[PDB]
Design a protein around this ligand. Structure first.
Ligand SMILES: Nc1ncnc2c1ncn2[C@@H]1O[C@H](COP(=O)(O)OP(=O)(O)OP(=O)(O)O)[C@@H](O)[C@H]1O
Ligand SMILES: Nc1ncnc2c1ncn2[C@@H]1O[C@H](COP(=O)(O)OP(=O)(O)OP(=O)(O)O)[C@@H](O)[C@H]1O
Ligand SMILES: Nc1ncnc2c1ncn2[C@@H]1O[C@H](COP(=O)(O)OP(=O)(O)O)[C@@H](O)[C@H]1O
Ligand SMILES: [Mg+2]
Ligand SMILES: [Mg+2]
Ligand SMILES: [Mg+2]
Lengths: 319, 68, 321, 193, 54
């Protein structure tokens, strides 16, 4: 009963949406833009299936690019220790399994056996990859199906199977060069090809400046983290409150209103026009995915044009 | 390979508008929220009738019969 | 088969000594000549920083990692052997070495019993101690990934043989490396010479480049020392006991003066360089080094002297870099 | 007798599968072929096993399944909403309905339009898919010349033009279908090993 | 230059003293003499340089 009163109090707040963004990974300093992406990914989107067995993805994938020592790893670490299901891995996976599945045969008589991978183990969760820009060739090709079809298909000697991989990928990558070259486009700075780049719903770029004020603010904050210990971190909502609210939000399955539908088509038309190739059909569904996640954060069962507009800005920021 | 099907993605106002409208309509149609068994079957049939002139299960049976 | 009140009194008396830092540095490596800075860094690594268990923040590691790279002529393996002899917990390993047990956990078969057994690797067995890796240059890709995971998450995860488990690996690393050729070329950068990924090389708090430059004076003194081998020094047992007691009991805490000094030092280092002279990692490394130095003096409070010593050790390695 | 094993899809990720021994009596033999995914309706039975007892050290009884019915679940994940042992089988009334449908003039257009109804256009990728699904007639001239009677289709297109969805629909509709990925398939994983 | 096999190192020293001690053991005289050290040095030179220069 006491928890229910707290839950109702949170949704009653007018500034609830802002507080949740500010309550994600409080250790990180001054990266509200990245925090908003992580919050929406946890809420996710409604999973739908058509009338003839065709599945429509409802998971949000986020890729973070930044210069060394920019808190890229810290974001993955927080997600690993907070979300219910999650796995921490790296592109240069040690295991013969890797990101995806692999086949191993006990020597002699014993037949080939399936060994789980990073993506497999994080089924129905979030798989955080530390270095996406160093994945194996095998994985790079293999991850094509996992990110969209949500399955892993293997056909090896004596074994054939389709493996569920319903996960959301939160990857961190470094620029192709030493640092992010602002002159070049995001495509140039990244080793990723066009197919993979389209499968990511959001992109975030973190830069490393040299201003004295920024350095002083960041330097002091780290020190107080060790000095004041927990007292330094005072988010609007604790981890327990945020975890409970997120679970409550995931129960909602918001729909698209008539006004939102017409507005949704117009925004996609504008986005495609500016591209003429980062924009494709996958981005039309991405706005639907983000719109549902934004609605869940507000605990509302109908998606309004305002939510659609907010999704539009997030995709534009990625370009 | 007997048949080759080349697929091109080109920016066009009318094509983009129509494709987006159809995709949005399909997404709304498949929303999970949107006798009891008979009622479920009837509503599923009504949903299917919009986009397919032939029932899917009947189509699979037809294909199997024609092949055999 | 072939700690008491007096021990605590002796420890406190030794701590009260003014020249405790130099005494410990000398006692660590009596047989190594003219590597004071390396010995000081090794001592600070041995004592280690404060482990923080944060609510809302997560886990911040207090370990210190040091890389010993340079010419092959200089003494580098003897330092690792000494560190093993001193550290209460640790294991000796060489990359790509069959003799060693291994750096990562693995699932094996008990020949004796014909049973499935999960055996922990060298890094896991070093939990809370110092793991010395003699030959860092030659190492498997898999092993490199395991090392990266250990130095990033401090835990080893295995999901093979039907077993899904995570093993604690909260251990420090003191590795050694050699150049690609017969010597280290000063003209080329350290990254090219050591032949290691920039990512893995950027995680070590202190990087030491011990180079055997041909100098008449240095060569003569080294010859004198070596031929004579054919300032008080502490016994190895007492040094190990002191390190164990300090690591078990004393827990330093940062003060306002330490905060101000750390902030000023980081700002100054950043302002030196556009070229980036230092990053945020160079601040956590300084914090860990200052905490370790405070641990060495059996102090529960980090003061300005510890921060001054930390900036200096960190700066000297950066200057080599 | 067959060795039934937990399907990779249903087993928890990273955990060893469990298995049971299924006994197939008369009229049930050869209906299930190795490597397939099936649903087994049977009787759960136990019996005394001496070696089991010996090995375990406890009075533990061996267990088996006496098969009553088998349903081929291979490649039929999306068809689990239907009823009957075989969803591709037909009745006499359904055959009459098929004849009535076929007699219509515009049957081919309807068949093409019914291929992947959720995909907006690509009426050239739907026609090819329908033709491949129905296939041709193999021929053997005088017993000396053999002519293939199947149609192969290749889709070479842009990243987001709904090709994988078309392949999934074909897998669902086809009586016997197998799905494989680029690098996930070996030279002897295809064919025979 | 590139002709050298490798730079002399303290290991070369220890080897020189080892060879001198072995030669002294050969001589059956406790004290290591300068002749033994010179012989060890000439052996070191002729092991490699004598044939390389040819
Ligand atoms: N905005 C920030 N707020 C707090 N700490 C920060 C911030 N940016 C960087 N740091 C510090 O940077 C240190 C190193 O960064 P981190 O371990 O998160 O990975 P990274 O260096 O950005 O990534 P990578 O390993 O890919 O190079 C962290 O301990 C964190 O304390
Ligand atoms: N400062 C020093 N004091 C004493 N001995 C030294 C010193 N520097 C070098 N040496 C001598 O150099 C030799 C180096 O031997 P060591 O086993 O340490 O080599 P290493 O670093 O492992 O070599 P490599 O890279 O060729 O494998 C030893 O004989 C050691 O006595
Ligand atoms: N013509 C179309 N009609 C309806 N939906 C489409 C169309 N083209 C693409 N989509 C949507 O975009 C996504 C395309 O992904 P997919 O086809 O699996 O990638 P690939 O083409 O590389 O296999 C699908 O989820 C699908 O719903
Ligand atoms: Mg990182
Ligand atoms: Mg060595
Ligand atoms: Mg595809």
């Amino acid at each position: 009963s006491d928890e229910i009163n707290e839950l109702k109090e949170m949704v009653k707040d007018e500034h609830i949406y802002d507080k949740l963004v500010r309550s994600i990974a409080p250790a990180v300093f001054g990266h509200e833009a990245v925090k908003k992406g992580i919050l929406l990914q946890m809420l996710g989107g409604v999973h739908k299936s058509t009338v003839e067995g065709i599945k429509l993805r409802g998971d949000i994938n986020i890729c973070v690019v930044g210069d060394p020592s920019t808190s890229k790893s810290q974001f993955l670490k927080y997600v690993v220790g907070f979300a219910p299901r999650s796995v921490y891995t790296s592109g240069k996976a040690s295991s013969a399994a890797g990101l995806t599945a692999a086949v191993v045969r006990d020597e002699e008589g014993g037949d080939y056996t399936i060994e789980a991978g990073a993506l497999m183990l994080a089924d129905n969760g979030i798989c955080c990859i530390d270095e996406f820009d160093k994945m194996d060739i095998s994985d790079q090709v293999a991850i094509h199906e996992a990110m969209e079809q949500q399955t892993i298909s293997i056909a090896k000697a004596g074994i054939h199977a389709t493996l569920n991989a319903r996960t959301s990928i939160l990857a961190a990558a470094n620029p192709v060069g030493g640092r992010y070259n602002r002159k070049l486009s995001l495509r140039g700075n990244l080793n990723m090809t066009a197919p993979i780049m389209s499968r990511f719903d959001l992109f975030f770029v973190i830069l490393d400046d040299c201003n004295e004020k920024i350095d002083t603010e960041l330097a002091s904050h780290i020190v107080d983290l060790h000095m004041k210990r927990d007292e330094a971190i005072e988010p609007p909502f604790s981890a327990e409150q945020l975890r409970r609210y997120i679970k409550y939000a995931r129960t909602f399955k918001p729909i698209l209103t008539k006004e939102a539908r017409s507005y949704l088509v117009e925004k996609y038309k504008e986005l495609r026009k500016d591209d003429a190739y980062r924009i494709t059909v996958r981005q039309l569904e991405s706005m639907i995915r983000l719109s549902e996640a934004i609605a869940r954060a507000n605990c509302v069962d109908e998606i309004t044009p305002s939510f659609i507009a907010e999704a539009y800005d997030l995709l534009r920021q990625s370009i | 390979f007997d048949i080759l099907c080349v697929v091109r993605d080109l920016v066009d106002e009318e094509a983009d508008e129509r494709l987006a409208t159809f995709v949005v309509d399909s997404h709304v149609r498949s929303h999970p929220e949107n006798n009891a068994r008979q009622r479920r079957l009837q509503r599923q049939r009504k949903k299917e009738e919009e986009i397919s002139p032939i029932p899917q299960e009947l189509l699979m049976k037809y294909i199997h019969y024609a092949r055999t | 088969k072939v700690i008491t009140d007096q021990d605590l009194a002796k420890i406190r008396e030794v701590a009260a000594r003014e020249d405790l830092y130099s005494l410990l540095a000398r006692s660590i490596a009596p047989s190594i000549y003219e590597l004071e800075d390396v010995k000081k860094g090794i001592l600070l690594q041995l004592f280690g920083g404060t482990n923080k268990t944060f609510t809302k923040g997560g886990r911040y590691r207090g370990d210190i990692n040091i890389l010993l790279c340079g010419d092959p002529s200089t003494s580098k393996s003897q330092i690792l052997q000494y560190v093993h002899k001193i550290t209460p917990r640790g294991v000796y390993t060489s990359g790509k070495g069959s003799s060693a047990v291994g750096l990562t956990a693995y699932i094996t078969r008990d020949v004796d019993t014909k049973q499935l057994v999960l055996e922990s690797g060298a890094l896991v067995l070093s939990d809370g101690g110092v793991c010395c890796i003699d030959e860092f240059d030659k190492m498997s890709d898999s092993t490199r990934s395991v090392l990266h995971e250990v130095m990033e998450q401090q835990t080893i995860s295995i999901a093979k043989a039907g077993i899904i488990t995570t093993l604690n690996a909260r251990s420090s690393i003191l590795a050694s490396a050699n150049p690609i050729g017969s010597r280290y070329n000063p003209n080329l950068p350290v990254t090219e010479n050591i032949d290691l990924p920039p990512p893995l090389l950027s995680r070590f708090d202190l990087v030491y480049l011990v180079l055997d430059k041909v100098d008449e004076k240095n060569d003569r003194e080294l010859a004198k020392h070596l031929t004579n081998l054919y300032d008080d020094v502490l016994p190895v047992e007492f040094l190990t006991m002191y390190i164990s007691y300090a690591k078990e009991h004393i827990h330093p805490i940062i003060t306002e003066a330490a905060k101000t000094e750390l902030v000023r030092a980081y700002v100054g280092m950043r302002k030196m360089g556009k070229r980036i002279t230092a990053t945020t990692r160079q601040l956590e490394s300084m914090i860990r080094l200052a905490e370790a130095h405070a641990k060495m003096k059996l102090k529960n409070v980090v003061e300005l002297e510890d921060v001054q010593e930390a900036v200096r050790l960190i700066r000297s390695a950066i200057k080599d870099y | 007798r067959v060795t039934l094993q937990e399907a990779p899809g249903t087993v928890p990720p990273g955990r060893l599968p469990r298995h049971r021994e299924v006994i197939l009596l008369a009229d049930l033999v050869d209906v299930s072929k190795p490597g397939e995914e099936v649903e087994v309706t049977g009787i759960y039975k136990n019996n005394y096993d001496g070696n089991l007892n010996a090995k375990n050290g406890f009075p533990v009884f061996a267990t088996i399944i006496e098969a009553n019915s088998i349903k081929r679940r291979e490649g039929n994940t999306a068809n689990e909403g239907e009823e009957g042992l075989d969803v591709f089988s037909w009745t006499e009334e359904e055959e009459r309905e098929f004849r009535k449908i076929s007699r219509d003039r515009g049957i081919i257009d309807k068949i093409i339009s019914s291929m992947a109804p959720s995909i907006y256009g690509h009426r050239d990728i739907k026609t090819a898919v329908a033709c491949s699904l129905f296939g041709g007639v193999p021929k053997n001239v005088n017993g000396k010349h053999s002519i293939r009677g199947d149609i192969n289709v290749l889709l070479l297109g842009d990243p987001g033009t709904a090709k994988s969805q078309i392949l999934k629909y074909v897998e669902k509709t086809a009586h016997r279908a197998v799905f494989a990925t680029g690098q996930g398939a070996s030279a002897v994983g295809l064919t025979a090993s | 230059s590139k002709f050298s096999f490798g730079q002399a190192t303290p290991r070369t020293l220890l080897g020189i003293i080892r060879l001198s001690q072995a030669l002294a053991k050969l001589r059956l005289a406790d004290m290591v003499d300068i002749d033994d050290v010179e012989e060890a040095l000439r052996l070191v030179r002729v092991s490699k340089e004598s044939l390389y220069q040819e």
